[PDB]
Amino acid sequence: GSLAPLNMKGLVKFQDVSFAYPNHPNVQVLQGLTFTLYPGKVTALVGPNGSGKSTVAALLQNLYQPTGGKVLLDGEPLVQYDHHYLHTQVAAVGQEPLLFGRSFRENIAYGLTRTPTMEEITAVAMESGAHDFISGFPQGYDTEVGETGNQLSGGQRQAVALARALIRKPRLLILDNATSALDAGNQLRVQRLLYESPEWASRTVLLITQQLSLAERAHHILFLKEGSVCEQGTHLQLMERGGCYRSMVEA
Amino acid sequence: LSGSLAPLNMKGLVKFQDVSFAYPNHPNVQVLQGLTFTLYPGKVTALVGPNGSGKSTVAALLQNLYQPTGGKVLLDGEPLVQYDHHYLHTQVAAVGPLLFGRSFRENIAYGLTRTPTMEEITAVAMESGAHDFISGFPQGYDTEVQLSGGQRQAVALARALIRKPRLLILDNATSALDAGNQLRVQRLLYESPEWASRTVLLITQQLSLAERAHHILFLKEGSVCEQGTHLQLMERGGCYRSMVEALA
Ligand SMILES: Nc1ncnc2c1ncn2[C@@H]1O[C@H](COP(=O)(O)OP(=O)(O)OP(=O)(O)O)[C@@H](O)[C@H]1O
Numbered sequence: 001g002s003l004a005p006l007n008m009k010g011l012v013k014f015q016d017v018s019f020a021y022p023n024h025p026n027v028q029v030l031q032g033l034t035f036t037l038y039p040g041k042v043t044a045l046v047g048p049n050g051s052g053k054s055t056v057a058a059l060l061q062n063l064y065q066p067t068g069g070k071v072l073l074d075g076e077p078l079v080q081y082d083h084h085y086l087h088t089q090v091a092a093v094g095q096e097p098l099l100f101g102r103s104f105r106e107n108i109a110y111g112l113t114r115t116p117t118m119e120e121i122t123a124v125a126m127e128s129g130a131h132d133f134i135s136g137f138p139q140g141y142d143t144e145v146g147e148t149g150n151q152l153s154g155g156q157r158q159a160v161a162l163a164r165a166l167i168r169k170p171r172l173l174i175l176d177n178a179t180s181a182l183d184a185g186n187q188l189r190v191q192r193l194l195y196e197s198p199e200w201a202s203r204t205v206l207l208i209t210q211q212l213s214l215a216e217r218a219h220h221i222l223f224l225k226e227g228s229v230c231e232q233g234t235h236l237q238l239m240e241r242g243g244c245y246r247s248m249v250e251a
Numbered sequence: 252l253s254g255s256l257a258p259l260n261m262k263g264l265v266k267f268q269d270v271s272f273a274y275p276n277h278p279n280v281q282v283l284q285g286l287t288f289t290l291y292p293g294k295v296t297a298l299v300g301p302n303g304s305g306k307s308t309v310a311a312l313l314q315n316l317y318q319p320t321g322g323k324v325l326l327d328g329e330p331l332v333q334y335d336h337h338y339l340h341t342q343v344a345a346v347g348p349l350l351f352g353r354s355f356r357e358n359i360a361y362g363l364t365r366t367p368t369m370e371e372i373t374a375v376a377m378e379s380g381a382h383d384f385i386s387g388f389p390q391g392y393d394t395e396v397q398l399s400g401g402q403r404q405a406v407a408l409a410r411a412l413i414r415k416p417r418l419l420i421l422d423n424a425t426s427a428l429d430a431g432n433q434l435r436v437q438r439l440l441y442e443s444p445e446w447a448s449r450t451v452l453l454i455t456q457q458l459s460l461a462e463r464a465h466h467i468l469f470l471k472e473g474s475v476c477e478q479g480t481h482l483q484l485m486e487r488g489g490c491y492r493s494m495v496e497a498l499a
Pocket residue numbers: 021024029047048049050051052053054055056384397398399400401402427429
């Protein structure tokens with residue numbers, strides 16, 4: 001399909017979604033999967049290894065389509081949205097991002113549908129915690145970054161990739177173990193970005209992590225087990241119930 | 252003298268003595284500077300500190316992937332360069348991707364200087380938390396290597412553990428593991444008799460993991476700012492406490 005609307009809220013709904021990878025049809029990854037990601041909220045997606053969290057992230061980028069049920073963005077099936085329109089409103093960051101371009105400046109601007117100013121580049125780098133280390137180099141943002149950012153440190157890489165996601169001003173930001181290498185100061189910066197920024201209380205965030213301390217301030221938590229939401233709610237609500245989430249935090 | 256040592260006995264006592272380092276192709280950036288510490292066998296030593304402080308660089312030097320530009324990296328009192336490269340590979344294992352066209356058993360067995368049994372491979376896979384998902388496949392361990400982030404880390408960990416190295420280096424190696432698997436690995440390192448005599452360097456930004464460590468090294472701008480146990484460092488009121496306070 002062909003949708004590319006001017007205005008977007010960012011309301012995401014999975015409705016009884018099922019999925020198996022195309023070249024492994026008999027292996028159910030997601031099943032009976034239902035949840036809502038509300039606009040301007042941080043929703044955490046947590047659960048055991050192999051439960052399907054990264055697969056959910058992939059469907060949210062329309063990398064694959066559900067085998068059953070519906071994946072909706074503002075009440076419209078995702079598959080109907082323009083490939084490029086989606087690219088502009090949906091941004092995913094993983095644990096080990098590939099950083100294209102020859103310098104920090106090019107790394108951050110890469111993939112953006114326009115030419116940003118250095119002011120804009122600097123702003124998002126300050127938000128992501130990348131600015132300080134970048135500014136420490138003689139050439140600053142024009143310092144050469146080699147072979148897709150593999151000469152940066154683990155956390156420097158994540159900080160740069162996050163800046164690059166932020167400058168797109170996406171309606172849906174997906175963080176998949178994306179801050180696991182950040183130091184405490186930068187992790188704090190990202191907590192402030194997620195929960196104390198005026199821009200991200202209007203945009204919607206899917207936060208996938210094994211570090212449940214990061215998810216405590218989430219507005220909603222989804223606990224995924226064997227491809228479906230076992231339980232969901234706030235940290236305190238889930239802690240009161242005494243189920244999967246409780247057992248994971250206490251462990 | 253390079254590559255002449257391969258002793259029958261390795262205590263695994265590691266000493267950095269006044270180590271300096273800049274990467275050969277970026278010589279203007281001093282990464283480590285006057286870096287001194289000791290990793291004792293029978294301890295998990297956590298190496299923590301800000302992004303870019305040089306922690307993964309310390310891991311690379313400990314594998315003899317680069318040489319210090321100043322000072323000494325000693326293993327049982329001898330400079331690392333003096334060990335035979337194959338020998339050092341039997342004694343030192345680092346975990347930080349899997350090999351494309353090989354089976355899971357071949358992936359776990361990879362880098363081992365002998366041929367292990369399926370019982371050997373299964374055992375270590377249960378310890379790392381890779382067993383259940385591998386067993387789920389119809390052909391099991393014979394399946395050719397797609398995996399989740401945590402499953403990949405579990406497989407990479409089993410590969411290192413099966414080498415039974417004297418020095419194990421974990422560089423953010425469990426960041427994708429779930430609570431269950433993270434707990435099992437911790438139990439293995441802190442409770443198993445085999446790891447009780449070995450030396451473990453645990454590099455992590457998850458300060459909770461650093462909390463059980465027998466010793467903690469706080470690295471800042473390529474040098475140790477302070478060190479001790481969690482409870483000692485919390486009392487001192489320095490960089491470590493500031494870091495723990497920021498997260499809390
Ligand atoms: N490209 C792929 N092709 C086939 N199977 C896949 C593919 N990617 C993932 N899988 C499988 O789908 C299941 C779900 O994987 P997924 O990566 O979504 O889990 P996860 O919850 O993100 O796990 P983790 O917490 O370890 O990251 C796993 O069993 C995995 O082996």
